[PDB]
Structure 1
Amino acid sequence: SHGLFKKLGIPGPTPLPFLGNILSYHKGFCMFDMECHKKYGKVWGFYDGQQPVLAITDPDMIKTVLVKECYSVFTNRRPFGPVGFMKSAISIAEDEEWKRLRSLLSPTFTSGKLKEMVPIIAQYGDVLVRNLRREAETGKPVTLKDVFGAYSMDVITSTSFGVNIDSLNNPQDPFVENTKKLLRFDFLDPFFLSITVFPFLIPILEVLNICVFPREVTNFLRKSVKRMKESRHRVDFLQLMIDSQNSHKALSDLELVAQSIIFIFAGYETTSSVLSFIMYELATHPDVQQKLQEEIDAVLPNKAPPTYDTVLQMEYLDMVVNETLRLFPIAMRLERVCKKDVEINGMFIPKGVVVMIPSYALHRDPKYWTEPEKFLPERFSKKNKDNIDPYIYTPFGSGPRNCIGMRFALMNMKLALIRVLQNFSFKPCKETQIPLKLSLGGLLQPEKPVVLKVESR
């Protein structure tokens, strides 16, 4: 199968036997995708072992894969295992089981169900400040993901279930301590390597009850959801799963935990990591931070409480969040498995090929963005948003399988940014790694953690 892209006349790096091109990942997915886009142009192919991966960068073709031909051709992502009972998780589900679950979990993030969560998040916004004030009253660096990680946990545990689990901290909370080591795709680990480079050992590992999420983490979270599921008010992610489990049919008990673990993860890890990138950029661009602070005070004078409506009114904040996501799309890539032979936009694609959208590369392509390395929130002004293509800039994906928690993620991060910049300013402190080095490993994180100085206003 290593002669596939030569057959189709599609350029790409020459693959080694067995390994394919995975050796080229020594700088990470992101540097590999940039170089290949520069070397080969609009379309190229490579192999993750024996798995052909076709990378597409054309906006029309991307819309076909992500939106037009989703339900019929590009329905699922690259198979990820061994996962055990977590195969029922929405992000991992396939075909009919995914359609069932997506529809069932959509009503969790309506503008009505979101509006109902601002007062709940309004509790832990003030808590995030009080923990910040302590580290501010005394000259000392502040690791942001710890304090952002704590905030995220409280926000996902109470809006989806109704359970306050972090009493002002309580910094050694078992939820965060177990959830951070939930999945760490270390490519140096022979495990995630051999899974990718020889993706036929999953069935063995599955019958051996081996899982990519450690057992004590899955157990602790599994015990807790059974401890949370009693419910004997407001309809929440726990209620939407329980009212329909009580009523084809239906939602299982090991399935109801699976969706909770997915939500519990993304709510904690994705939110806190993007919040760190933002604050790093504001601290390294004081003009942008002052301008954002100037906007927050105009919309919310006297440190007014942020509301659902006032969050959406702030134009510069939305630009700051978007430009950061442009530079740091935490998904790095978007993938879809081609389930049958298709010829999209005049290009034949055979069954079984994974179609990959190099999001990180597209977000930094000079042919789409001026000075793509520079942090310029003005790209996303309404004056300039004409020249921004929704299929080049896809930080939450696109189409029927985009980020289901997008609106929740943006509001939770915006509510956090408002109540923080309302009370503090952020300066570098030399131990701040400048410029920021990105983790040359699997997921999108920095090398050294983000540490900043916090001053009170």
Structure 2
Amino acid sequence: HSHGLFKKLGIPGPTPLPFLGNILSYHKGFCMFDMECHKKYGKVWGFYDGQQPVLAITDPDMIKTVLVKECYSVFTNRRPFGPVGFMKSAISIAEDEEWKRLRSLLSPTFTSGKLKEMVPIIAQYGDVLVRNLRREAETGKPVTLKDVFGAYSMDVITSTSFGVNIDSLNNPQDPFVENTKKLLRFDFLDPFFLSITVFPFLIPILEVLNICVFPREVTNFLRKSVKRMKESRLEDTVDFLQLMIDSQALSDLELVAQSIIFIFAGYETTSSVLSFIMYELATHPDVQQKLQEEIDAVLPNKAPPTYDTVLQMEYLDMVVNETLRLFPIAMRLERVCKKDVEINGMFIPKGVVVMIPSYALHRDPKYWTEPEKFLPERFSKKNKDNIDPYIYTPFGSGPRNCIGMRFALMNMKLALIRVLQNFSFKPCKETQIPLKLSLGGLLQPEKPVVLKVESR
């Protein structure tokens, strides 16, 4: 048993059980477990995912060292998670040299120039989202946001990876829609991933059986989807595909891996955050009116948002950020400790997963006044400098942060601008209040957010 380590290092934690470790404590969610631990062990503590020692850390300096300083030398990778197949090459999964190589090649993809070039595209599906919303605002029946936002999010993804101009909501049965939709993942507390942690010694076994967490089903029709366009569309002579093609040491059957992860990364994420935001504005009509006014002051007479226009919206940026404080989609940030180290006084042995509890740190009394309340003013220029960048980490930090940050932000904002210009979102009878979060390992709502939509 490796279960003696935190006792021996003099680190407090909940007492692990044989084989299971502390996993049974997840029955309440990463979220309440991390908050409880913080509350009763203080700044630093230790637990076991099966036989895997995880060290939680909460000190801004120490986090900065793990996330930003010793990233390259010591804390380079995330923890392996289950049988991954060819997706071992995807940037967010890759390790060491291979990761450093991929992050360089793909960095040019997420530049402001490429992003400004992507505006007219993502924006054009703002109009579709509106159109679509306009029909359902005439029904007067509760809208399921995550579904309307889902279609928008797919729509924006497809289009910025080799223009696949699909009206995703109203082409429910299109090859690109059906596959992509199914790439809704991953819950690391579901039955499957649970066993993966009580039995990591089973991963080698499933890998050799070709069993993959990214279901073979989906990855198949994308490997093949990509193969023909990549060859045909530029044989006759503005998207991630092109940007990728041009920069060719980037292997063929690694480009597919990047392509899949950008779908898997923006699809469920952009749509979830957006839902959480529209929930927040509905249950906060004041904020929503304040927002609609900012937008109308900047873009008078429903004028179409632009790149520069979007950045100019102080209050929009504040609403987005607050929503991310309350519902960070990562929940935790993790790095594997590559060799023995001494960071800000304390010793980390090689092999330990070092873990920063974002969801918990985002809700900590030491840093936030009335931390349960949705209050966008915390992010106004008056108060924002009191906000520590290593407590508030919705996009991680350091060399291994979210490569898609500015794209995520811009995308989401463009959706909000076009949507708020045209509609108001009011809660109805089916709407859950206060919103309850899911007990799983994906931070999402128990019941899908349903809201009344009214035409301005």
With normalisation by structure 1, the TM-score equals 0.96
- 8 Å contact 1:46–1:52 — kept in the other structure? yes
Deviations 1:270-302 (A, max 9, x none): 100000000000000000000000100000000
List alignment gaps of at least 5 residues for structure 2.
none
Distance in structure 2 (CA, Å) of the matches to 1:351 and 1:244: 36
Deviations 1:368-413 (A, max 9, x none): 0000000000000000012100000000000000000000000000
Query: How many positions carry a matched residue from both structures?
Result: 451
- 8 Å contact 2:58–2:356 — kept in the other structure? yes
TM-fit CA distance, 1:154: 1.5
**More deviation, 414-423/235-244:** 235-244
**More deviation, 219-228/414-423:** 219-228
Q: Helix, strand or coil: the match of 1:116? A: helix
Q: 1:410 to 1:188 in 2, by over 3 A?
A: closer
TM-fit CA distance, 1:187: 5.4
TM-fit CA distance, 1:253: 2.0
**More deviation, 262-271/88-97:** 262-271
- 8 Å contact 1:62–1:357 — kept in the other structure? yes
TM-fit CA distance, 1:228: 2.6
List alignment gaps of at least 5 residues for structure 1.
none
Deviations 1:241-273 (A, max 9, x none): 21222xxxx222221110000001112111000
Q: 1:183 to 1:51 in 2, by over 3 A?
A: farther
Distance in structure 2 (CA, Å) of the matches to 1:409 and 1:449: 21
TM-fit CA distance, 1:227: 3.0
- 8 Å contact 1:166–1:173 — kept in the other structure? no
Q: Helix, strand or coil: the match of 2:130? A: helix
Q: Helix, strand or coil: the match of 1:266? A: helix
**More deviation, 164-173/378-387:** 164-173
- 8 Å contact 1:80–1:92 — kept in the other structure? no
**More deviation, 162-171/199-208:** 162-171
- 8 Å contact 1:366–1:372 — kept in the other structure? yes
Distance in structure 2 (CA, Å) of the matches to 1:175 and 1:80: 27
Q: What corresponds to 2:246 in structure 1? A: 243
TM-fit CA distance, 1:81: 2.4
**More deviation, 327-336/117-126:** 117-126
Q: Helix, strand or coil: the match of 2:182? A: coil
Deviations 1:325-354 (A, max 9, x none): 000000000000000000000010000000
Distance in structure 1 (CA, Å) of the matches to 2:232 and 2:272: 32
Distance in structure 1 (CA, Å) of the matches to 2:401 and 2:31: 20
**More deviation, 92-101/221-230:** 221-230
Distance in structure 2 (CA, Å) of the matches to 1:173 and 1:31: 40
- 8 Å contact 2:334–2:354 — kept in the other structure? yes
- 8 Å contact 2:84–2:212 — kept in the other structure? yes
- 8 Å contact 1:149–1:176 — kept in the other structure? no
Deviations 1:94-143 (A, max 9, x none): 00000110000001111111011111112100000000000001210110
Distance in structure 2 (CA, Å) of the matches to 1:174 and 1:390: 42
- 8 Å contact 1:12–1:36 — kept in the other structure? yes
**More deviation, 236-245/168-177:** 168-177
TM-fit CA distance, 1:80: 2.2
Q: Helix, strand or coil: the match of 1:44? A: strand
Q: Helix, strand or coil: the match of 1:364? A: coil
Is 1:263–2:266 an aligned residue pair? no
TM-fit CA distance, 1:215: 1.4
Distance in structure 1 (CA, Å) of the matches to 2:287 and 2:326: 16
TM-fit CA distance, 1:184: 3.6
Distance in structure 1 (CA, Å) of the matches to 2:132 and 2:231: 32
- 8 Å contact 1:50–1:198 — kept in the other structure? no
Deviations 1:292-313 (A, max 9, x none): 0010000000000000001000
Identity within the alignment, %: 100
Distance in structure 1 (CA, Å) of the matches to 2:334 and 2:24: 20
Distance in structure 1 (CA, Å) of the matches to 2:247 and 2:296: 43
Q: 1:55 to 1:168 in 2, by over 3 A?
A: closer
Distance in structure 1 (CA, Å) of the matches to 2:315 and 2:163: 32
Q: 1:223 to 1:339 in 2, by over 3 A?
A: same
Distance in structure 2 (CA, Å) of the matches to 1:145 and 1:167: 13
- 8 Å contact 1:56–1:358 — kept in the other structure? yes
TM-fit CA distance, 1:176: 3.8
Q: Helix, strand or coil: the match of 2:55? A: strand
Q: 1:167 to 1:371 in 2, by over 3 A?
A: closer
Q: Could you say what the CA RMSD is over the residues aligned between the two structures, in angstroms? A: 1.3
Is 1:161–2:201 an aligned residue pair? no
TM-fit CA distance, 1:236: 3.2
Q: Helix, strand or coil: the match of 1:77? A: coil
Q: Helix, strand or coil: the match of 2:247? A: helix
Within-5 A mapping of 1:176-255: 176-186=177-187, 189-232=190-233, 235-245=238-248, 250-255=249-254
Distance in structure 1 (CA, Å) of the matches to 2:141 and 2:173: 20
Q: What corresponds to 1:45 in structure 2? A: 46
Distance in structure 2 (CA, Å) of the matches to 1:396 and 1:176: 27
Q: Helix, strand or coil: the match of 2:335? A: strand
**More deviation, 252-261/168-177:** 168-177
Distance in structure 2 (CA, Å) of the matches to 1:328 and 1:209: 35
- 8 Å contact 2:82–2:193 — kept in the other structure? no
Q: What corresponds to 1:380 in structure 2? A: 379
Q: Helix, strand or coil: the match of 1:453? A: strand
- 8 Å contact 1:183–1:212 — kept in the other structure? no
TM-fit CA distance, 1:183: 4.9
TM-fit CA distance, 1:196: 1.4
Q: Helix, strand or coil: the match of 1:187? A: coil
- 8 Å contact 1:183–1:213 — kept in the other structure? no
Deviations 1:187-231 (A, max 9, x none): 564321111122110000001111112111111222211133135
- 8 Å contact 1:105–1:237 — kept in the other structure? no
Q: What corresponds to 1:352 in structure 2? A: 351
Deviations 1:396-446 (A, max 9, x none): 000000000000000000000000000000000110111111110121110
Q: Helix, strand or coil: the match of 2:425? A: strand
Q: 1:438 to 1:173 in 2, by over 3 A?
A: farther
